[PDB]
């Protein structure tokens, strides 16, 4: 059976933790790894899924996971400038180490349920645009956009394989 090596980055407390325990747990209420067998479009395969900011202590197995993660979610929160411009960092990392330029990704933008907002929607599309990746507005909290950006991901792996 297929099975798909997912990578959620970006800064401390943008939400990927979250966003994956609504993925895979179907809560939220306010574990770095999980697995869990879906179906997407059909298709049955085991998502397992590393939770990652970059500076946790097992640091070994963070750049293992991330030669081996086929696809990678860029999270940022829409009221967390720094973790906007922190993007750019994680997405050169990725690139890096993949020795790649041809990396399955999407980009996130999580905690749209709040009303402070100091990233504006069109500058991540424009960053997205510029990365060629989708865009993808989610919230942990109301599950917003959190199927559509992991079914994303996947379906952009697909393309890429
Ligand atoms: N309102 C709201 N809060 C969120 C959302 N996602 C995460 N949080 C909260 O943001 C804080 C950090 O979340 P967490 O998952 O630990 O961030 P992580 O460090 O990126 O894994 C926690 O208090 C979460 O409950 C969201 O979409 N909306």
Request: hydrophobic residues 35%; glycine residues 2%; proline residues 0%.
């Given at each position: 059976m297929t099975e798909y090596?997912?990578?959620?980055?970006?800064?401390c407390g943008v939400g990927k933790s979250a966003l994956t325990i609504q993925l895979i747990q179907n809560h939220?209420?306010?574990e770095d790894s999980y697995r869990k067998q879906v179906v997407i479009d059909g298709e049955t395969s085991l998502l397992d899924i590393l939770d990652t900011a970059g500076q946790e202590e097992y640091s070994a197995m963070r750049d293992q996971y991330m030669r081996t993660g086929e696809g990678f979610l860029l999270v940022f929160a829409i009221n967390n400038?720094?973790?906007?411009?922190?993007?750019?960092?994680?997405?050169?990392?990725?690139?890096?180490?993949?020795?790649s330029e041809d990396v399955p990704m999407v980009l996130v933008g999580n905690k749209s349920d709040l009303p402070?907002?100091?990233?504006?929607?069109?500058?991540?599309q424009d960053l997205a645009r510029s990365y060629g990746i989708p865009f993808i507005e989610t919230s942990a909290k109301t599950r917003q956009g959190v199927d559509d950006a992991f079914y994303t991901l996947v379906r952009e792996i697909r393309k890429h394989k």
């Open positions: 090596k997912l990578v959620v980055v970006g800064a939220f209420v306010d400038t720094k973790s906007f411009e922190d993007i750019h960092h994680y997405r050169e990392q990725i690139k890096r180490v993949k020795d402070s907002r100091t990233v504006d929607t069109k500058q991540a």
